[PDB]
Amino acid sequence: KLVIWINGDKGYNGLAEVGKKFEKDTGIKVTVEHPDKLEEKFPQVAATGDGPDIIFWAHDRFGGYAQSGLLAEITPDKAFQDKLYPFTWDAVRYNGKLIAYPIAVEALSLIYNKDLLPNPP
Amino acid sequence: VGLNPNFSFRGKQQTRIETFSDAVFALAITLLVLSSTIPETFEDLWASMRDVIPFAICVALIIVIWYQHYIFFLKYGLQDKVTILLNTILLFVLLVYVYPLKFLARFLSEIYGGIFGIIETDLSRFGEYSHQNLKLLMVNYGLGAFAIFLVFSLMYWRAYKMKSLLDLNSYEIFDTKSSIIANLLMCSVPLLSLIITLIDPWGNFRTTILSGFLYFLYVPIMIVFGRITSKK
Amino acid sequence: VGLNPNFSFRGKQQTRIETFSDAVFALAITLLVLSSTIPETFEDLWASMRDVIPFAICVALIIVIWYQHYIFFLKYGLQDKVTILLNTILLFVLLVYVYPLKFLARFLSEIYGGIFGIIETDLSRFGEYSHQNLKLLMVNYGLGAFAIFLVFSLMYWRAYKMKSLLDLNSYEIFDTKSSIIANLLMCSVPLLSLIITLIDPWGNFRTTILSGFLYFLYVPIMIVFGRITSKK
Amino acid sequence: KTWEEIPALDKELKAKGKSALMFNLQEPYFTWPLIAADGNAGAKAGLTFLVDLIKNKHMNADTDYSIAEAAFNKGETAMTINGPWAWSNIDTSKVNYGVTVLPTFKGQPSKPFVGVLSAGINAASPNKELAKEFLENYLLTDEGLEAVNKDKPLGAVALKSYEEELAKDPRIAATMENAQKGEIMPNIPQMSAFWYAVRTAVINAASGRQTVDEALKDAQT
Ligand SMILES: OC[C@H]1O[C@H](O[C@H]2[C@H](O)[C@@H](O)[C@@H](O)O[C@@H]2CO)[C@H](O)[C@@H](O)[C@@H]1O
């Protein structure tokens, strides 16, 4: 069983639709879980118990997992490596070892209601 | 782009009344400038450039009317006989006051030019600055300003009278009612100068000073009339 | 029809600001030609046909402004107070420079007529070609050109300030930023003649030669200002 | 805008095979606004006008809720007098309708009686606490009143949270306009005997049995 841990504010249903195409082409089950406090439940469960196979979180929490020895070193071939922006790979690097796969750059913005506020602060 | 977020703009499509109206506003500001003579020599060219301050004041004044027109037809999308009639009265007043404004703007630009000390050219070109002529100056331009705001009040009242046909909601009814009050309050200041000038209490220039001084106290005097109706 | 394939044209629907603006541009080019006197005799008819070269230069100049206006309102579909204000300032500058352009175009057509050897008619009709008058010629038309491009920069900056309200994508943000730079770079050449003429380093015609010579080096001097900002 | 210009409009419309105004004359709640427009002298004026409409064959003698509603929805009458609840049936029909201020009579406005739709619990019920739960947590809620309102409109709901949606509706504006020109009914026990006295008075004067002066005499007793 392939088990993925990703936060509940992300697109786990869409991630499951990718997991459903994977089972069609291989035969492996892809369940997607979203537990509360997974950023601080993963290093406790994954150290002792089994936990997930793959963990999804912003790159900032991964250095602590890498130092503790809770993450496998990523070894992607040049052709896969070349598909992503070289600056994104730098964010997922700890002591000259790739510790994760970069997915997307996130930054907070000001979301505003144009009807209640056309020219916001 | 819009004034109110609660208003549903019925006049987003351009109509003949608005197209005709845009032609008239464009023509008014265009002919105000291009009614001047073509410079034939360097001397005429420098003379013609002294006219830009008077024209800037006239143009600023006309687009402010054009803006109010744009907002009214945007809000209600009206196109009936009475709206056409009131709209024609408006454009008619505008048109008859285009060249008189060119005159007033040139006259006041010389008077304010003398004050600040930029120029020192004669005002004898304008004719005789007598009490009767300076009183008729207030009464004329005062009657012009009063009529424009009076017509905008009548136009908003016509939309208020058709509130149900236009399917106006509680917010839109309130806006329309507020727009009538705004235009009557705007029409009240030139009406008060005009009346003071026509009675002429002092029988001398003092009358014209007071009549002219009500426009400098536009904002405060508008607040007094607005405060009197709210206090009761 | 469109400039950029990545731009989503918000102003495909015609609005009142654009309709009003078209009236003013049509009136400017129309009255430039039709402000002339009606020929009453064969002699007037031949005189009036000498005016087509000056008019072609004026008309070419005005549609180039009209085109930039068409592209701006096509790109953003703007209709707010500040866009109306900047749009009025633009049309105002256009209007005050219509008859002065008719003058400059006739004057330069005689000067270039004398050079090539097509005609040999007098320039004494224009008044006195003195240093002060030839300096005011640069300062006047230089101030006109600077203002038009300055206003186009302010208009694009107003759209840049409303990028989120207009839902501008990365390509459209880039275009808008590039359009501001283009118009400021265009406004920089008349600003540099105007300043050189107003200081008047030589105290003689040499000043006017240099000021006039910056327009012949428009493209190269625009590239120097563009290269200075990219080199840092 | 005035009641007194309806006879002229009706003459104009009857030529084109249409009525001007059809509304429920049987129930006094619909005729009361005209009766109470001026006021007594006001009730005598208002009712005599209503009697003259039936006497001039502008309105039918036994005009009830159903034939008035049906006639307006069919497109036979140009006007009708009704409440919020009636709008949904007009929307169902293909009639571009408007809701507006009631016509004025003798210059002054027609004062309709304002009702507050209210839910009461029967004193002889064992489910008093179950009904309180239904009324509070399920009906008197943004979601509960929306369900009732999309069936047949409630009018100006008592729920504070509905203020903005009510204010966005033009028909509610016209309803509130008439409600301000009218007055809320007292809840008093004598309202039943009062309504019956007005129901008979209006029917007798409409059919042609008792005079307008004799109708207010029997109703004041
Ligand atoms: O007709 C007199 C009758 O009028 C009122 O009843 C209204 C009711 O309030 C409305 O909701 C609507 O449905 O119509 C009724 C009249 O048809 C009074 O509330 C009632 O006491 C009185 O009998």
Side-chain angles (χ1 to χ4, degrees):
Chain A
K1 197 192 200 196
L2 201 52
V3 46
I4 317 185
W5 278 16
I6 190 163
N7 204 39
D9 72 338
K10 311 300 195 282
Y12 52 82
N13 314 92
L15 181 57
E17 299 332 291
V18 184
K20 282 168 68 172
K21 192 160 175 188
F22 195 61
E23 91 161 57
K24 184 189 165 183
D25 299 13
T26 61
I28 301 149
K29 170 64 192 297
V30 187
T31 199
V32 183
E33 291 179 18
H34 49 79
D36 205 56
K37 302 208 175 180
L38 77 98
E39 73 277 3
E40 58 188 65
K41 191 79 197 190
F42 171 83
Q44 309 290 354
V45 172
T48 55
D50 57 304
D53 297 289
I54 38 179
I55 173 60
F56 279 75
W57 192 274
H59 70 282
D60 77 293
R61 284 287 190 185
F62 286 61
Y65 304 159
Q67 187 180 242
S68 305
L70 308 165
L71 286 170
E73 298 147 30
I74 305 315
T75 305
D77 69 293
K78 195 83 195 312
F80 176 78
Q81 221 173 117
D82 293 354
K83 291 166 190 170
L84 281 65
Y85 298 103
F87 90 84
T88 71
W89 285 115
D90 299 337
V92 295
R93 203 194 314 279
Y94 190 83
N95 203 48
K97 293 279 188 174
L98 287 177
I99 68 171
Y101 281 85
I103 318 306
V105 183
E106 342 186 296
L108 295 162
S109 292
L110 180 64
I111 305 181
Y112 70 98
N113 190 332
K114 289 172 175 199
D115 303 303
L116 297 177
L117 181 62
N119 196 325
Chain B
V1 166
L3 183 140
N4 267 347
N6 299 292
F7 220 104
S8 302
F9 306 126
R10 296 155 176 79
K12 272 287 187 191
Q13 294 306 135
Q14 282 58 35
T15 64
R16 291 200 59 187
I17 195 174
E18 299 158 28
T19 298
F20 176 85
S21 294
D22 284 328
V24 172
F25 279 102
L27 279 161
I29 68 108
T30 301
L31 291 172
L32 177 120
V33 175
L34 304 197
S35 51
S36 286
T37 61
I38 291 48
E40 290 149 54
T41 171
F42 302 124
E43 186 187 284
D44 300 0
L45 183 58
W46 318 138
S48 73
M49 298 293 80
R50 290 166 58 258
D51 259 347
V52 314
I53 297 307
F55 295 172
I57 298 148
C58 294
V59 165
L61 218 136
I62 295 153
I63 43 120
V64 140
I65 296 166
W66 177 86
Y67 186 79
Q68 288 266 283
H69 190 277
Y70 153 72
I71 293 301
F72 174 84
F73 284 96
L74 177 63
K75 282 190 207 304
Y76 309 101
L78 287 153
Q79 216 173 281
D80 58 295
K81 279 160 277 164
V82 177
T83 296
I84 289 151
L85 167 56
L86 291 163
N87 184 73
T88 300
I89 288 157
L90 188 78
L91 295 190
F92 172 79
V93 170
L94 173 68
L95 285 171
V96 311
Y97 277 92
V98 177
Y99 294 161
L101 275 173
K102 198 171 155 148
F103 177 83
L104 184 67
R106 285 162 159 174
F107 176 72
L108 295 175
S109 289
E110 296 239 22
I111 291 167
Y112 272 77
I115 289 161
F116 299 134
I118 308 306
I119 57 153
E120 277 291 273
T121 56
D122 71 336
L123 290 80
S124 64
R125 183 193 332 103
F126 302 109
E128 169 73 343
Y129 43 93
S130 68
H131 177 67
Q132 285 291 111
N133 280 338
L134 299 183
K135 279 198 303 186
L136 293 154
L137 218 72
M138 290 280 164
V139 168
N140 186 46
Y141 301 101
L143 181 62
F146 156 78
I148 276 148
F149 296 119
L150 177 65
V151 175
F152 276 121
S153 307
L154 289 164
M155 288 173 104
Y156 277 103
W157 203 330
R158 167 45 153 190
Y160 185 89
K161 290 190 295 180
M162 302 174 99
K163 66 197 167 181
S164 300
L165 195 53
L166 297 163
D167 288 320
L168 296 188
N169 72 38
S170 291
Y171 298 126
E172 296 161 321
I173 301 294
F174 190 93
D175 171 304
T176 308
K177 201 76 222 177
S178 277
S179 287
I180 290 165
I181 299 318
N183 286 295
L184 289 167
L185 284 181
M186 288 277 177
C187 108
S188 75
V189 182
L191 195 67
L192 186 55
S193 295
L194 179 148
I195 296 285
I196 287 162
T197 308
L198 286 165
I199 187 58
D200 179 27
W202 296 282
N204 67 69
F205 196 61
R206 284 175 175 82
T207 301
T208 298
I209 289 153
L210 181 57
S211 293
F213 190 65
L214 307 198
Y215 294 89
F216 286 85
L217 300 189
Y218 220 117
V219 165
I221 205 72
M222 272 185 310
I223 296 157
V224 168
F225 276 88
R227 277 194 194 184
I228 287 160
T229 57
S230 80
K231 282 178 191 178
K232 302 152 191 185
Chain C
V1 166
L3 183 140
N4 267 347
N6 299 292
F7 220 104
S8 302
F9 306 126
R10 296 155 176 79
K12 272 287 187 191
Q13 294 306 135
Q14 282 58 35
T15 64
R16 291 200 59 187
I17 195 174
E18 299 158 28
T19 298
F20 176 85
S21 294
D22 284 328
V24 172
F25 279 102
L27 279 161
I29 68 108
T30 301
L31 291 172
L32 177 120
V33 175
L34 304 197
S35 51
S36 286
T37 61
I38 291 48
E40 290 149 54
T41 171
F42 302 124
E43 186 187 284
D44 300 0
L45 183 58
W46 318 138
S48 73
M49 298 293 80
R50 290 166 58 258
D51 259 347
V52 314
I53 297 307
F55 295 172
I57 298 148
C58 294
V59 165
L61 218 136
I62 295 153
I63 43 120
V64 140
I65 296 166
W66 177 86
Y67 186 79
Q68 288 266 283
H69 190 277
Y70 153 72
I71 293 301
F72 174 84
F73 284 96
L74 177 63
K75 282 190 207 304
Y76 309 101
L78 287 153
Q79 216 173 281
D80 58 295
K81 279 160 277 164
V82 177
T83 296
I84 289 151
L85 167 56
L86 291 163
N87 184 73
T88 300
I89 288 157
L90 188 78
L91 295 190
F92 172 79
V93 170
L94 173 68
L95 285 171
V96 311
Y97 277 92
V98 177
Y99 294 161
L101 275 173
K102 198 171 155 148
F103 177 83
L104 184 67
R106 285 162 159 174
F107 176 72
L108 295 175
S109 289
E110 296 239 22
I111 291 167
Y112 272 77
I115 289 161
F116 299 134
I118 308 306
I119 57 153
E120 277 291 273
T121 56
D122 71 336
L123 290 80
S124 64
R125 183 193 332 103
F126 302 109
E128 169 73 343
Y129 43 93
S130 68
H131 177 67
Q132 285 291 111
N133 280 338
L134 299 183
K135 279 198 303 186
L136 293 154
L137 218 72
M138 290 280 164
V139 168
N140 186 46
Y141 301 101
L143 181 62
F146 156 78
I148 276 148
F149 296 119
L150 177 65
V151 175
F152 276 121
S153 307
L154 289 164
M155 288 173 104
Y156 277 103
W157 203 330
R158 167 45 153 190
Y160 185 89
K161 290 190 295 180
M162 302 174 99
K163 66 197 167 181
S164 300
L165 195 53
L166 297 163
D167 288 320
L168 296 188
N169 72 38
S170 291
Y171 298 126
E172 296 161 321
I173 301 294
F174 190 93
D175 171 304
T176 308
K177 201 76 222 177
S178 277
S179 287
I180 290 165
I181 299 318
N183 286 295
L184 289 167
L185 284 181
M186 288 277 177
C187 108
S188 75
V189 182
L191 195 67
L192 186 55
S193 295
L194 179 148
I195 296 285
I196 287 162
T197 308
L198 286 165
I199 187 58
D200 179 27
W202 296 282
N204 67 69
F205 196 61
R206 284 175 175 82
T207 301
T208 298
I209 289 153
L210 181 57
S211 293
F213 190 65
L214 307 198
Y215 294 89
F216 286 85
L217 300 189
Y218 220 117
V219 165
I221 205 72
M222 272 185 310
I223 296 157
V224 168
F225 276 88
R227 277 194 194 184
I228 287 160
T229 57
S230 80
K231 282 178 191 178
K232 302 152 191 185
Chain D
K1 297 291 194 298
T2 187
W3 269 101
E4 296 104 338
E5 78 186 337
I6 292 165
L9 188 58
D10 180 62
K11 186 183 172 180
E12 197 186 70
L13 287 163
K14 274 192 150 60
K16 309 196 172 186
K18 299 287 166 286
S19 303
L21 170 59
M22 287 189 71
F23 74 93
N24 189 359
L25 296 170
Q26 311 314 275
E27 287 283 12
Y29 171 86
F30 296 85
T31 52
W32 177 270
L34 176 52
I35 290 155
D38 209 57
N40 63 87
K44 192 187 181 178
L47 198 75
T48 298
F49 192 79
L50 184 60
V51 166
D52 288 317
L53 295 172
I54 300 147
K55 198 176 184 183
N56 287 119
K57 307 186 84 177
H58 300 331
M59 291 197 78
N60 178 36
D62 62 339
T63 320
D64 74 272
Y65 194 103
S66 304
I67 68 151
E69 169 173 44
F72 184 86
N73 296 13
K74 278 171 170 179
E76 310 311 321
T77 186
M79 306 183 288
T80 189
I81 296 169
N82 227 322
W85 61 82
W87 307 328
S88 43
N89 287 343
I90 311 165
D91 290 81
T92 297
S93 80
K94 297 286 144 278
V95 173
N96 182 16
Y97 74 97
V99 182
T100 192
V101 77
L102 292 156
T104 62
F105 178 68
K106 280 186 150 71
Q108 283 279 87
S110 49
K111 305 185 180 59
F113 254 134
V114 184
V116 177
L117 184 68
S118 313
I121 311 184
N122 184 3
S125 178
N127 312 330
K128 295 182 179 182
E129 299 307 328
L130 317 184
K132 167 165 167 183
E133 255 288 308
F134 171 77
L135 293 175
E136 289 194 17
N137 291 354
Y138 292 72
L139 174 59
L140 288 152
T141 62
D142 310 11
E143 301 79 15
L145 300 170
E146 176 202 70
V148 177
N149 208 87
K150 68 172 57 157
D151 181 19
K152 297 235 186 79
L154 289 157
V157 309
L159 210 64
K160 290 186 330 190
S161 62
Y162 241 80
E163 197 166 346
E164 298 181 72
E165 277 186 312
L166 290 176
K168 280 163 53 175
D169 194 345
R171 306 165 296 172
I172 291 296
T175 307
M176 289 308 251
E177 189 177 339
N178 288 303
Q180 292 276 356
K181 288 171 182 298
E183 54 183 53
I184 282 179
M185 294 168 289
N187 61 343
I188 60 180
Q190 291 96 319
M191 286 305 293
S192 58
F194 159 62
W195 282 124
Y196 169 83
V198 182
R199 188 152 47 240
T200 56
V202 168
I203 291 162
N204 293 345
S207 56
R209 284 271 287 181
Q210 192 158 240
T211 319
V212 174
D213 182 35
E214 292 185 310
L216 302 176
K217 179 185 75 177
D218 191 22
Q220 195 69 71
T221 315

